[PDB]
Every structure is written in C-alpha cells, then in structure tokens.
Design a protein around this ligand. Structure first.
Ligand SMILES: Cc1cc2nc3c(=O)[nH]c(=O)nc-3n(C[C@H](O)[C@H](O)[C@H](O)COP(=O)(O)OP(=O)(O)OC[C@H]3O[C@@H](n4cnc5c(N)ncnc54)[C@H](O)[C@@H]3O)c2cc1C
Ligand SMILES: Cc1cc2nc3c(=O)[nH]c(=O)nc-3n(C[C@H](O)[C@H](O)[C@H](O)COP(=O)(O)OP(=O)(O)OC[C@H]3O[C@@H](n4cnc5c(N)ncnc54)[C@H](O)[C@@H]3O)c2cc1C
Lengths: 340, 342
C-alpha cells in the first residue's frame, strides 16, 4: 500500500511518523513517501516562535482542545529523556500579561503550575495590570523537523523534493492514499476560501540572559498583535504582528518597528541584544482545522485523500493529536480494503 | 574621612559602593580606596554558581534573614531596568528536589511564586519524591563585579593592587576606617578559628537549552553535596561538592566525576554539552557572618575597623543587606565624632 504525505512541515512529518510507527509492524507491505517543495529550514514551521500555548479563547471544535492536550502530554513525557533537547524540546516558564482582568484559559490545567500573577510580580511589568504564570515547553521548529526527518529516514521513509500540481498526478503516479499537509498553500491543490495567511514577522536575537517567556495581549487588536518574547534553545524570538489576509512574504519596515519598540519597552535589556535575523511566515489560518477524509476518483480505483491543514498560529501546539487522528482515519481506510 | 576597603569580591565592592553612595554628600573629603590582591575574574565570587537562594535551614543569626530579604528586594527592584543584565542580573525559575518531605524554607515568601511540586513535575525528575518550584534571580559574580568596579570608578573610588599584611600597616598609612572584606582569608590579618574554607568544585558547560535551575539535596550529606545545575547568563554551572576544612585549591578527578555523573543523571541532555572550564573556590564558612565594629590602637591613634566576612555559600544572596548594615555602623562612627547625617 502506497502512501504519499505532501508536506514536510511539522504537520506533514509528524503525521508520516505516526502512520509509519503505527502500521509498519502490521501491514506488509507499506510504502510511505514524503513529497514537498520545501524542507527545513525553509518551511513556516522553521520560523515559529517555538512555544506550546493555545489561543486564549476556547476552540470551536471540542476535538481541538483534546488534540492540544495530547500534544502537551506527548511532549512533556519526553522531558527526562536523554534526547529531549536534540528534538527541540525543553521546559520553560513564563508570563502572560493583560491590561485588565480576563477569564482563565481553557488550557490552564494542561500546563504546569498555572496561577494568576501577584502585585509584586506585576511591578516587573509596569504597563500591565493582570496576568498568569505557568510552565510550558519550548518546541523548536527547526530542530524538531531535523529530529523527525532523521527518525523517518532511519525507518526507510523516503523524501522527494518536488512540487505537486494536483492530487490527480500523485494518484496517477501510484499513490493509494494521499495525506495533504500543505499548510497555507493547500488552496492551490483544492480551493478553500476559509483558508487565509496569518502573516507573522519576527526578529531573532542573541540575548541568552532571558530565561522566561513573556507574552502580552492587546484585547482590542487580536491575538499576537502585541509584544511577545520567547527564549529559544540558542536564540530569542521577538514578536508582535499577526495580520490575516496579507500575502506579502517580504519583511515590512513598520512591523520591524512595532516589534522592536514593543519588545524594547517590555524588556529594555534588549538594547544590548544582537540581531541574528528577521523573518516572515504565514500561519494557515482557518476557522477550524481541516482534518478529514475525502474520496477521489481518477481512472480505475479511488485514491483516498486525508487532509490535515489549517492549524493557524498553533500548529506546534496541536500537531501530535492531529497526527494521531489522521493515523486512525488511515486505519479505517485499511479496514475498508480488508488489508487486515 | 579616609576609608580603606580590603577586598574586591562581592562583599568588598558592595560595601564600598554603599558607603560612598550614602555619605558622599555629607562628608568632605571622602576618600575611599579599595585594596585587594585579587580582582575579577580571580575571586571566589567569580566562581559562584550565580543564584539567589539561602541555605534550607534557618540561620544562627536571624539578622541574616532580613539581610537576604533586603538583598532580594534591592535586586528585584532593578528588574525592568535597562541595565539589569549588564549588572549580572536576570530572573530565573527552578526546582529544589528532595528524596523526602521537608519543611518549607524560611525564605519561601521572599522568592516569587513559591509552591510544592506536583506529581507530573516530579515525573521530570525520577530519583526524587518531593520539592519546590520558585522564581528567583541569577546574579552572576563575574558580571556584577565588573558592573560595581565601573560604578565605583565613576564615583572617584580608587583601586590598588596590594596584599595587606596587617591592619596596623593600613592604619599607619593613614586610614581612619578599615572595612575588612577579606573572605575566607580574614584569619591571616586576625586569627579567627570559626572561619573555615568551604571547598566547592564546579564544571562550566555550554548547554544553552537549559532555562531553569535544578538543585538536589541530600539531607544526610549536608548542603550542596548533591547535584546542582544553574544556568548562568551564557554558560551553565554544574555543581555538587562543598567540603569544609579542605584548602586544596587544585581540581581533583573524584569531584569532577561526582559532579559530571551526578548531573548527567539529573539532566541527561548534558551528554551533548560542551565542557568549557572547571574551577575550585573556597566559601568563607562561619557559623555566622562576622559583621561588627572593632577599635584598634596603634601609637595614640584610634583606628576604626568594620568587619564584613564569613558569608559561606550565600555571599551573593546576602551581600546587599550586609553592605547596608556596614553603612549603618559607619553612620555611628561618624555620629561619635560629632559628625552629622541627613
Ligand atoms: C511567525 C510565526 C510564529 C509561530 N509561532 C508558533 C508557536 O510559537 N507555537 C505554535 O504552536 N505555532 C506557531 N505558529 C504556527 C505554526 O508555525 C504553523 O501552524 C505550522 O508551522 C504549520 O505547519 P504546516 O506543516 O501545516 O505548514 P508548513 O510548516 O508551512 O509546511 C508546509 C509544507 O507543505 C509543502 N507544500 C505545500 N504545497 C505543496 C505542493 N503543492 N507541492 C509540494 N509541497 C508543498 C511546503 O513545502 C512545506 O513542506 C507560528 C506561525 C508563525 C507565522
Ligand atoms: C563553588 C561555589 C559556588 C557558590 N555559589 C554561590 C551561589 O550560587 N550563590 C551565593 O550566594 N553564593 C555562592 N557561593 C558563595 C560565594 O562565592 C561567597 O559567599 C562570596 O563570593 C564571598 O565573597 P567575598 O567578597 O567575601 O570573598 P571573595 O569573593 O573571595 O573576595 C575576597 C577579596 O578579599 C581579598 N583579600 C583577602 N585577603 C587579602 C589581603 N591580605 N590583602 C589584600 N586583599 C585580600 C581577595 O583578594 C579578594 O579581593 C559559592 C561559593 C562557591 C565556592
């Protein structure tokens, strides 16, 4: 049985590994290949802030909260392992800062040690009047992608740098199942007017003194359009823009300024931080993750397509629950072909 | 008047700056000098792990508790300032790990967000069954010493290479007041058998992924003779020996192995960490800090000495309270000569 995963971002590769690890031992034969037109370090994943944290507001689909939880438990469970850091993973603690009282987030018990900030803590941050403290996990996009491609490759899964033009051509090339993990460009293969770019720009900086995440919110401007600081494994990510609808892949001058001045004010030690790079990427914004089976019909036979895209600004955060769910749906497909 | 501070470790330079800041505007002249035979990076201070945290048990002198507290609030008050990191100062969070239930430390409300660990947190650290979480402050010895010498120099305080042989020497050189901040070597200038070396060996390592401090305790083997991991501003300190009475300044292989393997066991990601140096230093261990005024007579001059030494394995943690207290006692020396403050 031939499976082509399209996409080598976090979603693509996580899914490929989950399918393979789940079915290799039982389905003979099983051929899994990954096709993508960019690999690390050239994916949106590579440019992610690298923090586990859902949006502040509850999810529409209740399945999404479960997926986020299963992802946290999965990642956390690696912590005492020798390889957690080679995977891109380490524990970090930090602050969410608000100008007024807000409700507790749905994820308060998923993270470790959630509590509200005290007045002394708040004086660390003069511009803000309310917030949270918790411990979470760094998951570095770049490093995680290199870990997964290594695990996948060791297991015989083969990668092809190529651009896919249609589902039809891949089916015709002999795929029995296609997993569509094309991120924000999924519309090219099948129009989807709910799918939009979430344009985020970031500044990467050497400031290794900073050991905590610091996330501000502006209620009247929408999520991640206010200053955020996230220490990564070797560098710090500085953020504060997230505009849906903008397809500009180039770094913008006002966003640079929004980010630098917002963050220099949040964290004035940044004055001595060396700029390492500045980047722009597109989160696959969609009111709901598209994670569903579709049957396609070209010549003899159906080829089965399973979509997994539209994870917005939380793909690192949610990725493993989604991979598990795709692997289940793939189980159902096998069953319907009496492959077990 | 003429003040000679002996010592350029954290205690020496803290105290010098605190005196100068408090009394610059009320005395004329005020001639403050620092004499030391080692300066950064060659003091014990430079080799400290760089964390704010007192001993787990209450101190003999309860004054020490306020001194630690004042130090925290002082340091904390710099967070949100543009220069906090140039001073060696940044917030950090972390874990204290125990093999059995222990009482809360007296300093639990001084730190930020003290709580007990939950079972999932405890799963991160297999060999341990109980402990704490809190946020505290890194104060890097090396950087803080550099910041202070800069601040002190800007203010007209003068530094001299000088191995002092007696208090008499310095009095007769014309010091009116001597502040004795000589750390573990204070016994040289005035015997003090309550003062002993606390030999600590450490390994410095590049492992910038580590964001939290991690301190284990072994109630039976005494304090800091259990693995400890403390991220610094750009490298990580790996520890686990603290042996009183040992004057051996050279690194030994047995403590190396105790530290490496203990810490690899605590934090197995350390397998990929690059070793970047290994050091030994001597905490000035004393049942309590010696912080007191003494009058010495040489010819018919009275000289005032104020001691500030014996801060053991917590000099960074306590230093500012002790400097403030020395400044107090200096006020009283002034007052006794009909000189006026505020
Ligand atoms: C600035 C920024 C910061 C972020 N920070 C975080 C964070 O801190 N935490 C978090 O959880 N999430 C974060 N996100 C969201 C996260 O980055 C995305 O949800 C995630 O990277 C999307 O993963 P993906 O694999 O779906 O898409 P991508 O990583 O973009 O992967 C898409 C893949 O599909 C391939 N592809 C597409 N079409 C074709 C085709 N036709 N032929 C061949 N190959 C194709 C591409 O080459 C690529 O391999 C952030 C996003 C941005 C922009
Ligand atoms: C391995 C290790 C880790 C530690 N970690 C921590 C920690 O994480 N947190 C913490 O709070 N504390 C820690 N400590 C304790 C801390 O290092 C000490 O309490 C502190 O550095 C002592 O400061 P000091 O200025 O008294 O002495 P020092 O730093 O030793 O300075 C002594 C000064 O006196 C000078 N001097 C002495 N005699 C003479 C003389 N005759 N003439 C001229 N000059 C003289 C020396 O040259 C030097 O300038 C640690 C100690 C060790 C050994």
């Amino acid at each position: 049985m031939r499976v082509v995963v399209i996409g080598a971002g976090v979603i693509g590769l996580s899914t490929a590994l989950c399918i393979h690890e789940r079915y290799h031992s039982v389905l003979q034969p099983l051929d899994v290949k990954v096709y993508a037109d960019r690999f690390t370090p050239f994916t949106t994943t590579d440019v992610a802030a690298g923090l586990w944290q859902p949006y502040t507001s509850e999810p529409s689909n209740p399945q999404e909260a479960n997926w986020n939880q299963q992802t946290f438990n999965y990642l956390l469970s690696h912590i005492g392992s020798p390889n957690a850091a080679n995977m891109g993973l380490t524990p970090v603690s930090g602050y969410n800062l608000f100008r007024e009282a807000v409700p507790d987030p749905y994820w308060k018990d998923m993270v470790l040690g959630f509590r509200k900030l005290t007045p002394r803590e708040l004086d660390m941050f003069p511009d803000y009047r309310y917030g949270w403290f918790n411990t979470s996990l760094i998951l570095e996009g770049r490093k995680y992608l290199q870990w997964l491609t290594e695990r996948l490759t060791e297991r015989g899964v083969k990668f092809f740098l190529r651009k896919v033009e249609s589902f039809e051509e891949v089916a015709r090339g002999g795929a029995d199942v296609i997993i569509n993990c094309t991120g924000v460009w999924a519309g090219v293969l099948q129009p989807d007017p709910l799918l939009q770019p979430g344009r985020g720009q970031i500044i990467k900086v050497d400031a290794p003194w900073l050991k905590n995440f610091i996330i501000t919110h502006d209620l009247e401007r929408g999520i991640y359009n206010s200053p955020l600081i996230i220490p990564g494994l070797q560098a710090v990510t500085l953020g504060g823009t997230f505009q849906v609808g903008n397809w500009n892949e180039i770094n913008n001058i006002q966003d640079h300024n929004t980010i630098w001045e917002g963050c220099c004010r949040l964290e004035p030690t940044l004055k001595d931080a060396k700029i390492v790079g500045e980047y722009t990427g597109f989160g696959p914004v969609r009111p709901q993750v598209r994670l569903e089976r579709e049957q396609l019909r070209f010549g003899s036979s159906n080829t089965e397509v399973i979509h997994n895209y539209g994870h917005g600004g939380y793909g690192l955060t949610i990725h493993w629950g989604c991979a598990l769910e795709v692997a289940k749906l793939f189980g159902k497909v096998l069953e319907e072909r009496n492959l077990l």
